[PDB]
Every structure is written in structure tokens, then in C-alpha cells.
Amino acid sequence: HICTHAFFKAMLFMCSGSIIHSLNDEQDIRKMGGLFKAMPFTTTALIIGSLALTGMPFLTGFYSKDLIIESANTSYTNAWALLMTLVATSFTAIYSTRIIFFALLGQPRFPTLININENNPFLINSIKRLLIGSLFAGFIISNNIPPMTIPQMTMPHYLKMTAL
Amino acid sequence: LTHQQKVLQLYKRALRHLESRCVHRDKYRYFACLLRARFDEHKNEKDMVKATQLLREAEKEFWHGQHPQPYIFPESPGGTSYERYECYKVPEWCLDDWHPSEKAMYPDYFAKREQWKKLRRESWEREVKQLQEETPVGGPRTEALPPARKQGDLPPLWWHIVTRPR
Amino acid sequence: GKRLFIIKPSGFYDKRFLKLLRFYILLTGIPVVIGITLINVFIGEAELAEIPEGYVPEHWEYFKHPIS
Amino acid sequence: SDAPPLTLEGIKDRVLYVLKLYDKIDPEKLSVNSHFMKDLGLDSLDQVEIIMAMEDEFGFEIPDIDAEKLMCPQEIVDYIADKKDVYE
Amino acid sequence: GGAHIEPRYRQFPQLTRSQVIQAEFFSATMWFWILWRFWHDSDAVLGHFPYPDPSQWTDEELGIPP
Amino acid sequence: FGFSIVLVLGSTFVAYLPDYRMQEWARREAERLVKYREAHGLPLMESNCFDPSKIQLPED
Amino acid sequence: RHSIFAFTHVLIPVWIIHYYLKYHVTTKPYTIVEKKPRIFPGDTILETGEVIPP
Amino acid sequence: GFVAFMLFMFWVGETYPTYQPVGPKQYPYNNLYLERG
Amino acid sequence: ARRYLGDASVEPEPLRMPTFPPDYGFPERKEREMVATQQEMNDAQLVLQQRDYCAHYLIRFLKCKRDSFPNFLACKHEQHDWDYCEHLDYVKRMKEFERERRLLQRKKRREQREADMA
Amino acid sequence: MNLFSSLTLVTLILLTMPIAAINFNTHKFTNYPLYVKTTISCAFITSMIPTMMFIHTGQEMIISNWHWLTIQTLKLSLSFKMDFFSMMFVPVALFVTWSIMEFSMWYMH
Amino acid sequence: SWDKDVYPEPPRRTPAPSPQTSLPNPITYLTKAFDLLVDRPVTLVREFIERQHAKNKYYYYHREFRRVPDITECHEKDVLCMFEAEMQWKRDYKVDQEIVNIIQERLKACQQREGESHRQNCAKELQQFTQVVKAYQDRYHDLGAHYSARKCLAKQKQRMLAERKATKEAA
Amino acid sequence: MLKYIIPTMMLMPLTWLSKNSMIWINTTLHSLLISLTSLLLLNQFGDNSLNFSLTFFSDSLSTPLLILTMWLLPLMLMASQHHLSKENLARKKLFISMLILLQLFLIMTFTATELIFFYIMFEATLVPTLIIITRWGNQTERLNAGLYFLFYTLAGSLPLLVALIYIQNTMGSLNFLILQYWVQPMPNSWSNTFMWLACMMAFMVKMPLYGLHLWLPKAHVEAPIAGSMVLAAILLKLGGYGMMRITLLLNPITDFMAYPFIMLSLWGMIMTSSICLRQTDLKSLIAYSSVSHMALVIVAILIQTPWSYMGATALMIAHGLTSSMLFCLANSNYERVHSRTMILARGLQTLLPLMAAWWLLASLTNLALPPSINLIGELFVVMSTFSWSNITIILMGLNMVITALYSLYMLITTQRGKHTHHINNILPSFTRENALMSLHMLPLLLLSLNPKIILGPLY
Amino acid sequence: WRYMGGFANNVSFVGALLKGFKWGFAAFVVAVGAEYY
Amino acid sequence: LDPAEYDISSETRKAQAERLAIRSRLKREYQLQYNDPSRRGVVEDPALIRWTCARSANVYPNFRPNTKTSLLGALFGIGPLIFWYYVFKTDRDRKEKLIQEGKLDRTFNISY
């Protein structure tokens, strides 16, 4: 989960800079604007990275976080940590909902005179390689992990169906 | 300090906190309009004490309307800039000494710069005369800098020609 | 504008001192490095064996390296 | 980069532009010299509004003390002109 | 320098065709992948968690207390 | 004299000077002695820095 | 050729360092100590007797 | 919240499947006898 | 955990496991299933608590990784094989949960009340 | 097996740059930041080989190089510990920093 | 070419490569190519340096130190004998230091070799470790900054007496 | 050793007879040429401390400290110029003469076998320093802080002579070699009380323990930069040094007698480390820093574990170069604007962009950065003191955090945050400044490779 | 102005998670065509 | 902190505070405001010299009359300090005990 997290949040910052510097720089979630305004690729990075860091539906980091809450969801945990896991990951998802419902949602409201530019091989190549890797990196890390223990893998109802 | 800037300040930063409140800017609009009426009924009375009273009431009622992270445009003191570039500001008295080689690196700058050195070396006597003349005893009352009547420079100029922001 | 005139503290004294410092540290660096290389190459370091019978070993040569 | 500077033509077109978007007074008389109050008699509270939304046009600075006394449009252009970096 | 970035005031920021080409392409990548292996995966992966019906195993019944 | 001779020259001197504090010799001697101690079966490192075979003890 | 010159920029470290280890490892008793390679009963002698479940 | 936890510290959640019917029920140590037949 | 063995074997720890069987030992009805040689079990080094029965499968999976290296997928089948065997095993400890819970209810209740009759 | 000696190469592949950032004092003006970036990638592939070697045969070899002083009963040298924690991590670090450095070439221009 | 039985190298026990599936050869292209690129181009150089060394040999000797009466035969004062005794005591001391280093390194290399087996095959070497380090622990351990012989001999007096009372209570 | 005693004594008339304008050249030159042979001094080997002559010898510790001294003269003298660079020739030759003679008595002191020769040469070391800082110290009111400073020394520093001579006629020889092997245990009682306390407090006045630390700050703000690098790079290490040796005897006594002083140094380490955080006037910060590290040293001396010495001596040397240099930074900043007050000017990342690297580098070397010798010594000392008391690490590591905070606070607000722009004087750098800084750090960073030179006799 | 333009059509959320579904699970639809033919 | 009460400023406080305050201020603003050419060195302002000299503790050497002072200082270095004396001596002696008797379970300790 450290490796995967590195990919995902590195993506998220390295896009957020595209937002900021592209905007001049306000870097406040107020103002901001909608998703697609000459910003296709950065916003794509933001629902790859956002949708990613949500805990993933089935995507890469899922190979970390979901397994984590499965095993931690079970056995001898003092059990104050289970609810902790649940509402924790949930409020992570709601962070994502925040940054979409503000930065990506409403029609543009912010200091006028659009200066925005996405055109430059440096960014597109950067975020490019990081996302191409990200979705395919967590999958290599997935089943190349020489087995170090017994996975739960027998997961009861209501202790299984609560991750997603 | 006068009623003018008191009221007007409360109005202005009230609009600021209100900006920070809402979103999509339209709700901000007609709310700000209800406020526009809230101060619009005001101001038509020259009664003295009643006014400052009601104002103070708007000082508490305003102080309720402060959420802790009011929006701050970047350039003023705030979490965005307030001299991000400050390590880049080098005062013009530096470069007064570079090596004469590098002083020859850019041969024509110091030409005009020398026209400034003479501009304000020829000066400052005209300046000191005009100032020592105008100032009332001690110069207590004025923080301002009144101009020069004769053709020429405005006397306390030197620092006011500044290294610019980036 | 087209090209603004930048203001830097100065370039001459820093760069100068560095050029000098490198010049000298290298000036006796190179002969010494070359030396360690040579006596590392042509002359062998050393080899052990052991104290011969009824033999007086000298002061030095209890030590491996020749520069020792 | 953040390439484009605000030049005199530009800022003129801007203060001029938004003041032409102000509805309650008409584009009829708008000029850098055209008086920002005495001509239009606008509320001083309303000039506080003008400087408000114009600051939100250019997004910076404009302290309250200096914002108080601004008035005429050419002057506003001037304040933005020395505060920003403008002249050739 | 100028890339034909076209700094614009008040209209929709101009956009490079190839860019939305890229972004859309990677949308297709994300969901193509995700429902792809969602057809290659399972969210209940093995035999189901057990049930008390064998908790009878009534043969086990106590010997001495009939 | 400051940068050239003492820094570079001296730094090569004390870089490798003869074995300092003898600890290299300590390694060699340790190797030989340990090998002997196993090969002849004696337990190595017997404690007792001096043989109780020769010593005397005060008495109450 | 330029990229092969940068490939030299990486390759000279391979020469030196690898040389440093070619004489180095032998010169000193303990270093480069590696986990004993994983051995399987597939190699040597295998004992299973397995089949099933389906 | 913390001291509430340390009240949860001596108490526990358990493994499987579910919890707190409790009479003097088992807990992991596997306890009495052993027999089948 | 079938026997106490002894510490005179000079072996603390995995040469002394709880016993050579990792978990319980099943005096119960009959024995414990088959075996995996401890020597092989070491010479393919297996983390403790990764080391149980079903290793018949596991060690074959560790084959399948180095079987075809460049293949990432390799065997999903043997993966599912020790997945299945230890599925069934964890389910067995479920059945032990069952056996003991019901023994509690039965002998507790019956013997308490029918002991408290007189 | 000594390709893990190439693993202790890659660290010096990173070591290379600051030496360039000091000694020559001119061609750095030629846009070395590009050069740093290239060094990072070289470290990424040259760092990628050992991961593959491990994930077939394992074989993690720790190296002590030349020892750091001695003192009393404990001779502490230095090491490079191939745990599969290092093996797996370092390509990630070099990779993410590859990204962030190219992006930075865009950010700080 | 260090002395072998001092620093054990167990059997190498290298497994036999089985392809087991037909695919590309991802590392082996580069293990052969590496052994083409980085093996010989260095090997020639090391060998040339070898012959260059070998044309002129050196002989350097490991020093010896004879023995002396040590602390016993010295009188309460008159340092002239003492100096020898106590300084060579210091030598033998440092020797014991390096013994402790040797054992302590054997343990480390032992765990690294075993792998996940940590408690399997290091039992013997860890055992002799506790033996030696308990010896050193008993003898030199607590004395202080200023220590020569008088203090080691002293502590040995202390243990001999404490164990003589311990062995009268053995009755 | 005598081969090191002549060349400086010959370095005196080299100064006195010379043409004007060449004095700095001649002195610097031949003084570095001395430093070479100072580096020759390391033969030290095996067990027996080398003995040059029956009058004076060298063990390890004397050798690192001595090398540091003979290295430190040319850099010192090199630094002192342009503090004046205008005067009659007699002032110059007098000053250089005084630095020389001071070095001579220092070499006497470190090399001295027999403790009375050590003591005579001891106060004979103190006088030249006094003449330096008082005769021209920039003299803020002069404070008379040289003279009754010498009274802070002698006040309780004289009776150690008494105690010595007692040791003399009771045991005969005061030769250190034979004081060793003849040392005999001294029980805990009231006579051994006044004795142990005599010797201890006698040296403890020099490295200031928190009780007496008022000694340093004034004396070190009034010192001309040469007298400063003299003072805090060396003259404390004399006290700690002699302490190292005379603790040979006092064997059981130092436990029951040690404990209060240890307490006072463990608390005063934190206190001093605190007060040095909040002050203005930069020249003091590094002073109280010296007080802190020296308190740590005393802590290391009293607890007698060998680790304690290894870390101790390592801290003597590393703190010598670090503190010395950092002073010389304060001075190089002082010639620019005449203040001594820290907060007055600021910036100097913009301006003097190189002098940054030396500020940063040196401050980090006082920040206890892991490879730096300062962290080697401080680290081993923390190990020893944790061995002594499992509890004391709260205080120790708390000193870690505070020393971090001020050591990195000095790095800022002198060097960063804005240019005060009413300055318009500072002239960019010099080559000499870079020479001084370099000659400080470069060896301090190289020693971080092969430290086994500077670790103590026990190794 | 902040309303009128190519703006003001905008998107409602879950449209962001509907951004590229058409081509994406289009190629998903075809995807199994490899093993089914 | 928390501007409040919105003071009516009265009349004197208006005239006095305003005129006198900004009087002295503008006097000193214009004073250091000269900023001519030909000054090479610092502007030297007598401000902050008072700061430095006073913060050099001018009343430190003279005396400390009792009042509450000796109580604040003595009790300021009293409670924590001497108690730490007692705790390090305590844990000291305990350590010595568990060494000399029973076991501290040091086993291998060595470098110490």
C-alpha cells in the first residue's frame, strides 16, 4: 500500500499543479470551476487519481486497501479499529467527492482572463507515464508478492460485503 | 477612523466573508442583495448616537458571520503568495560594485544608470531646500510628501523607484 | 518586456574563488592520485609468507602496503 | 511563464469594459477622465462595490485605505499600473 | 514562448484536439480495464462461509445423559 | 600551503599511515589464535584473565 | 552513438564497481552474503502422494 | 475517545462468526475434554 | 500439539514447532492428515504461520512462480488449490467452534439444571 | 549474482550528478536538469534488472564494502540491504521521482 | 583467500535451473551479455595488474609478541617489570576484542545465509556465542575508564572469593 | 616533541625581524609548515603511549588536541587580519608574537608529563589570552572582563596546586606515567572530600558547568576574533583535558562525589541550551552553545565508561572546529555591518549567495548531522549516559531537540527572510573568508571518513 | 458571463464516472470476441 | 486581541491621542526617512540599541531585593530539580541492587 499510494498521490499532486499554475495560482477550492474546460487530461488524471484513492472499485490500489480492510476486518482486532476503518475510508471517498463537486463541477467561477494551457510534452508525458504505469503497476505488484501468510480468502457475509 | 471608513469597511469585509460563504455565485448574489438592502435602508438619518449604536450591533452580528478561513486573494498576506519571490529582489545599490569585467558584460545599461546617478547626484540640494522650507515646525502633522514646483524631480524619490515584483 | 535586465548579487568573486580552489586541490591532487595508481600497479602491494627461522626482520615491512 | 502582462491598452480596455458592464449607469458617459462619482453621482458605498468586483476582476491587493479615495477610472488604471508591472 | 496558446478573456478556452483525444483514450482504458477484469474476477471468490446446520451433527450427542 | 600541501598531502598521510592502534594486527592475530583454539579443541576465551592455578586468596 | 556514450557514462561505473567487487569479494572473508537459494523437493527427492479435490 | 478505547481495551471483538450471546461461552483456548468415539 | 516431546532435543523453536504438526493435532477421532517432511519444509524456506498443512499445494505454487518466470499469471490453479485446502481447513476450525459451543450448551445446561433438581 | 553488484552501481549512478553540479561549472548551463532526469531513468532500468532476478530466484545478498572504524566489541561498517523491501521499493522511488522531475522541468522554468 | 575454518562457508547447494515453460529469456540475455561486456573487459585488466605485481614480490610478516611473567611475578611496586606485564595484558585484551568481533560476525552471516529458518542451523553458533560473550562479560566487562591489570586481577579476586563462599554454602 | 618546540620559538624572531607588509606572509607560511609536522606527530600505536623525552610525552588525546592547536594557529592568525590592517608595525608584531607565545604554552600544556609543569604552563597559558582580549577587545566599556576573569580562574583555581604538592610528597613522583601503576584507592571521607572537590571544581571552572557559566559570555563577546578562536576552541578543552587525566586517581570517590555535579550538568545542559535560544546579539549564541556541549563533556567525564571518553574527545575536537568556525562566521558578518546584534540585518541568501553554503554547512555540523564528527561524539556520549541511567535520555534527547532548534534558528534570520535595504554597505565576500571557512569545514568533513584518529586513548 | 457560453451545459456528477464509458466498455464488449472466436 | 467595545474616543483622547501620537510618529518617520546618497554604512537608528542594552540585563549585577523574588526563583529551581536529584539517585540505587543481587538479566551486555 505504500508503493501504490506513492503512485496515486504523486499523480494527484502532479496534476493539482496543472490546475494551480494553469489557473495563475489561487490554489483554493473555492473559485475553481468545472471539470472539462480545455482541461481534458488533467481532469482524467483527477478521476483516475481521485477514483483511485477512493479505495478503488476494482482498480490497482484495491489490491492494497481492500485486502487490508478484509484481514483487519477479521480476527483479534480490538474492534474499535473496525468502525475506524469503515468511516475512515468512507471519509476518504468524501474528500474525493469534495474535490470533484468543487474543482470539477460547477461552471467556471474564478478570476477571469483564462490563461490555462495544457499543451506541453512535459506534463502530458509526466502524468501520462505515471497513469499508464499506475493502472498497470499495481497489477504487477498484485500477484508478484511471494505469499507471506494465509490470506483470509474465506470472508463471511456482512464481514465481506463491507469494503466497497 | 471616521464613520465613513468604519461603515464602509464593515460592508466590504462583510461582502468578503459572504463570498467565502456560498458557491456558484448566484446565491452569493441575491444574498448580497438582501444585505445591500440591509445597509440601503440605512444612511438616510443624520441622527448621531443612534447610528454608531446600530453599527456596533452590526459589529457583533457581523462577528458571528466569520468563518475561520475567509477567502484571501493571493497577493496580500495569505496562504498563497505574499512575496513568494522575495529571494529574487536584489536592491539596486547592489551591483554598484561588480567586477569591471562584468561591469563590461552589459556595456549599455550603466549608461542610462549613470544618467540616473547624475540625475540624483545633481539633486538633493533642491530637495533639502524645498523640504526644510515647507515643513511646519517639527513636521509633525504630515506623513505626506508634497511635490516640487519648479521643473524637475519629486524630492524623496530614491527608494520609491523600486525593485519590482516578479 | 522582450528581455528584462536581471539583478544578481555578483558573479565574479564566488566563481573566481571556486576556480582557484579547484585549481590547487587538483594541482597536488593529480600527482598524488597518479602515484597511488602507479605504485598500486607496477609495484605490487605485498605478500605475507611468515617469519623465517633464525631471521631478524627489519623495522619496516611488518606492514603490508609499500607506502607504509 | 504566465506570459501575458497587463499593458496600458489592456487595463484601459478592462476597467473601461467592466464599467460598461455596470448596468445602473449607461455606457453613455464613460471615459478615463469622466468623473467616477460627480458625473454619475453613484453611491460611495457603490464605489466600494466597484472596487470590490474590480479587485475580483484582477484578483489582488487594493487595501481598504487606498481603495477609499480612488474615484476616477484613469486613476484606478494608474493604481493597478504601478502596483502591477505595466509600463514599457 | 507563444505556442498559439491564445490567451483569452471571457470566452471558452481554446483546446487542442489531440488532448481530448488522449484523455478520452485513457477513459476508455480505465473502464475497459476495470470491467474487463471485472469479467475476469469475482467478489465472492470461494465456497461460502459456513452455516450451523452441521452444528447438529447429532451423532455427537452426550453418551451418559440420555 | 593551506589547500595543496596539508589537505591533500596530509590527507594522504593519515589516509593510510601504518596500522593505527595496531587493530589490523589485532585482526590477523585474532584469526590465527581462534583457528588454533578450535583446531585443538580448547574452549576459546576462558575468561579468568589470570590462571587461578597461580594465585592466592585472603582468608577469614 | 551519443546514447551509447551515455551508455558509457553508466558503463564505466560497471567497470570500476564490478572490478572493485571482483578483487574485493575474495579479499575479505564476509560480504555479499546471500540467502541460500530456495531449494525445492522437485529437485533432489520429492515426496507427495497427492490428488483431489476435483 | 481514547479513554473510551481503553475501556474497550480489556473487552474485545472476537474472530468468528459473531459475538455476545455470551453466557460462560468458549473463547479461543479450546477448554474442556476431548472425545468423539 | 499432539505430544510434549522434550527440550533435551536441544531444539527451541521450529525444529520444535508446537509440535511437528503446526496447529492442533486432532486426538479426537483419527490422527492428522498425511505429512510434509520438515527437512524439505526448511530447504524451501517457509515463514512460520505460513507453514501449516496443505503445504503439498503451497510449495508447488512456489514451484509455479519460478516455473515460468516471465509469465506473471502462471498458475492461478495452484493458487486456488491451497486457497481451497486452507479454505476447507479454516472451515474445519469453524467446525471446532461449533463442536465446542454446542458441548458448552449441552453439558452446561443439562448438567446444571438436572444436577440442580434435587 | 553480481548483477546485484550492478544494484550497488545504480546508487552511484545517482551519486554522479552532484559531482557534475560542482566540478565543471559551465556545461551545467546547457540544461543539465534534463541530464539529471536521464540519470534517474538510467537508475530506473539499471535498478529494474535486480527486481527481476529476485522475483525468480530470491537471492538477497547484503554487502558490507569496507568497514567503518572498529571501536570496542562491535565493528559497524555500512551495508546495502536487499530485503525485497529495497528491491521492490527503489524502482518505485526512482520512477515517481522521474515523473516529478520532468514535471518540475515544466514547473520551475 | 582467508583461513577457511575460521569463517565457515557452508555447502553452496545451488539448484538446477528448470525452464518448465517455453518463453523468452529476460535476464539470461543480459547475464550472458553482461558476462560478455563486464566480465572480460575487467578480467584482462585485473590479470595484467596481477602479472605486473608478480614480477617483483614483497614479503611482509605478521609480528609476534613473546610471553612474560605478566602480573604475578611483579612486586607490589617497582614498575620496571610491571610495564611489560600490563601493556601486553592490553594487547591480549584487544585480541579478545577481535575474537568477539569474529563470533559476532559469524552470527550475522549465519542468519543471512539461513533465510527464513532463523532458529534452524544458527543454534550451534549462537550457543558458542553466548559461551564466549558470557566469558568476556564475566571478565573484562565492568572496570572503567582507567584499567590496567591490577583491576582485572582485582575482579578475578572478587569472583574467586564470591565463589569460595558460594562453594562453602554448596555444602 | 622538542622538534615542535623549537620551530615556533624560531617563529618569534621571524615575526620580530622582517620587512613591513611581509609579516602575515612569513608567519602564515612557516606556521602551516609547522602544521605539516604536527601531522607527523602520529606514530601512536598499540598500547604504550609514546614518550618522546622524560620531561613530556604524548598519549592519544594529547595528539588530536595538539594537532588541532598547531593547525589552528595559521587559520587564526590568517583570520585576525583586516580586523585592524592599520597600525604601527609594533602592534602587529606584538599581536602575532602573543599568539605565538600562547601556542607555545599550549603545546607545553598538552604535551606535559608531570602535573606541576602542566599547572605552571597552565596559568602561563592563561596570561597571553588575557593580554590579547583586554589590550584591544573592541572593549565595550571593557567590562573589566579580562582581569577579574582571571580572578574567576584563580579564585578557586589556585588550591589545586596545594592538593597536587600534597600528592607529590605523599607518593613521590608526579610523573603521570608513574602516578599510573602506583595509584592506590582512596576511601570516601571528609579529607578525600575536600581534595576531590578541590581538583574537580578547579578544572570544572574552565569548561563552564551551568553553575559557573556566567564566565564565558562576556569574556567571549569582548574578545577579538583571534582571541575567540583561542578561547572557545581550546581553552575549555584544557580544563576538560586535565580533568581526563587527573581523574585517574579519585577512583571510588568520583561516584558519591560525582552525582551532584552530574545532576547539575544534565539540568544545565537543558537550561543553557534554552537561554541560548531566545537571545539577540549573535556572538553570544555560539558561546552558550559552547557551554552546552561542554556540559555534555563533563557529563561524559564523570561517568567512566570508555564509550564516554571516545564520544567525549570526539566532541572536544568536533566542537572545536565547529564552534571556532561559526565564531569566524559571526565576525565575517560583523565586518560587513557593525552591530553584533543578530536581528539587525537579515537576508544574505540573496546577497553573498556563496556564504550561504558555509553558514548552512557549519550550522548543520553543529546540528548534530549523522556523519559529522559532532554526532559521532555526541552519539557515543548519549550511549554512555543511557547506560549509566536508563532515565536520562529524556533530558539528553530533549537537548537534541533544543540544540536542533537554536542551531537551526541561527541559520535563519541572520541569513534569510529579507534584505533590510537600509544597509547598502556589505561588500561581496572575499577570498580570505572562503579560505577560512574552507580550512575549517573541509577537515571536519574529511575526519567524518577516517575518525579513528580522533577517538580517544581507549579504542 | 460566468454562465453563458460553451459553459452552462456543464455535467452532473456520476457523469464524471460516466465520462468515457461508451468507447471503454465498447471495447469491453468486443474484448471477449478473442476467446469466443 | 479581539477588537471590541468600539470606543467612542470622546474628545480629549481624540485630540490628544491623535495629534500627539501621530505627531511623534511622523516626526520620527520623517527623521529616519532622509535616505540620502553618500551614506555607505548602516542607518544605525538609536532604536533597538535600547532593546539590546536593556536585554543585556542592566539590573542583573546590582542586587535582587527579597519581596517575592527569592521565592519565585528558589521555588523555580527547587521542585523539579531536587526531585530529579532524588529520582536519579533512587533509580541509581535500584539499578545497583538488581545488579548485585537476583538478576538484572543483563546476560550479554559488554560494551557499556
From Swiss-Prot, chain J:
Species of provenance: Ovis aries (Sheep)
Function field: Core subunit of the mitochondrial membrane respiratory chain NADH dehydrogenase (Complex I) which catalyzes electron transfer from NADH through the respiratory chain, using ubiquinone as an electron acceptor. Essential for the catalytic activity and assembly of complex I.
Interval of the full protein contained in this chain: 1 to 109 of 606
Transmembrane segments: 4-24, 43-63, 84-104
Subcellular location: Mitochondrion inner membrane
Disulphide-bonded residues: none
Binding partners and assembly: Core subunit of respiratory chain NADH dehydrogenase (Complex I) which is composed of 45 different subunits.
Family membership noted in the UniProt record: Belongs to the complex I subunit 5 family.
This protein's name: NADH-ubiquinone oxidoreductase chain 5
Curated annotation (Swiss-Prot), chain L:
EC number(s) from the headed UniProt entry: 7.1.1.2
Gene Ontology process terms (BP): electron transport coupled proton transport; mitochondrial electron transport, NADH to ubiquinone; mitochondrial respiratory chain complex I assembly
Gene Ontology molecular function: any one: ubiquinone binding
EC top class, as a word: translocase
Localization terms from the record: Mitochondrion inner membrane
Catalytic reaction(s) noted: a ubiquinone + NADH + 5 H(+)(in) = a ubiquinol + NAD(+) + 4 H(+)(out)
Transmembrane segments: 22-42, 60-80, 98-118, 147-167, 196-216, 224-244, 256-276, 284-303, 308-330, 351-371, 391-411
Keywords: Electron transport, Membrane, Mitochondrion, Mitochondrion inner membrane, NAD, Respiratory chain, Translocase, Transmembrane, Transmembrane helix, Transport, Ubiquinone
Family as reported in the entry's similarity comment: Belongs to the complex I subunit 4 family.
Name of this chain's protein: NADH-ubiquinone oxidoreductase chain 4
